[PDB]
Amino acid sequence: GSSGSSGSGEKPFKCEECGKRFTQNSQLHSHQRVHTGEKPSGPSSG
Ligand SMILES: [Zn+2]
Numbered sequence: 001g002s003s004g005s006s007g008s009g010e011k012p013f014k015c016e017e018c019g020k021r022f023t024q025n026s027q028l029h030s031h032q033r034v035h036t037g038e039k040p041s042g043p044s045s046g
Pocket of ligand 1 (some may be wrong): 018020
């Protein structure tokens with residue numbers, strides 16, 4: 001990995017949760033969900 005991402009293009013939307021970015025809100029708001037616990041209810045060890 002050498003200067004893989006120097007810095008080209010800015011995004012008006014950034015996921016404060018982790019720090020992601022998007023060109024539109026719909027995208028960010030659609031990703032933030034990943035932080036809002038995205039797992040199927042089913043507590044069991046087995
Ligand atoms: Zn995020």
